Design a protein around this nucleic acid. Sequence first.
RNA 1: GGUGACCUCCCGGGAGCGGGGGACCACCAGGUUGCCUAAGGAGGGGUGAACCGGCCCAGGUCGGAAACGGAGCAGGUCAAAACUCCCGUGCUGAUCAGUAGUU
Length: 105
Amino acid sequence: DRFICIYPAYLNNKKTIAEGRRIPISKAVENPTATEIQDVCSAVGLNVFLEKNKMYSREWNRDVQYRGRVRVQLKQEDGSLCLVQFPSRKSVMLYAAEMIPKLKT
RNA sequence: GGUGACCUCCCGGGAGCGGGGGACCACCAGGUUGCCUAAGGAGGGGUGAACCGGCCCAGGUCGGAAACGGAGCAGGUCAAAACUCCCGUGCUGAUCAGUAGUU
């Protein structure tokens, strides 16, 4: 239950910083989905679980392609980093951003 | 000096979110002014909706165990998106009396 949250808004290049986004547009992507996010995180060997029915507070678009939240574990609950490659939320996001595009395209 | 946006960094957080460094843009107030006008007030208003302003936001809604918060509707509201009318100012058609002043 002590896992960092991650909304797809954080990575969406068609959203302003005030609309949620957490990473520079240059590194961001178009319309990332919680599904896409979970898949690229898990596939690197991260412990991730997907909450299909959480919405972003700042998200306004009531249709399914923008719903969703991805929870990720960084820590084994002895305080140590599950992985050394992923110390921070930002380190997660930037990676997901880097990996999502190799899927569909 | 102010407002609103937008971009890019840190920092704290399980969320909504919290702390802080830069960059840029728009507008505002009112303090000096000009290689400035034919004349250019630092006026007065109104719209600000079907989503585009900003603010306050019932409900609802998203996040939350909750506190509370986000986004924001109906309604209210504006020194400060944008739009627009009026006043002033400048040129510029025109009207009336057959009015004069003087023939």
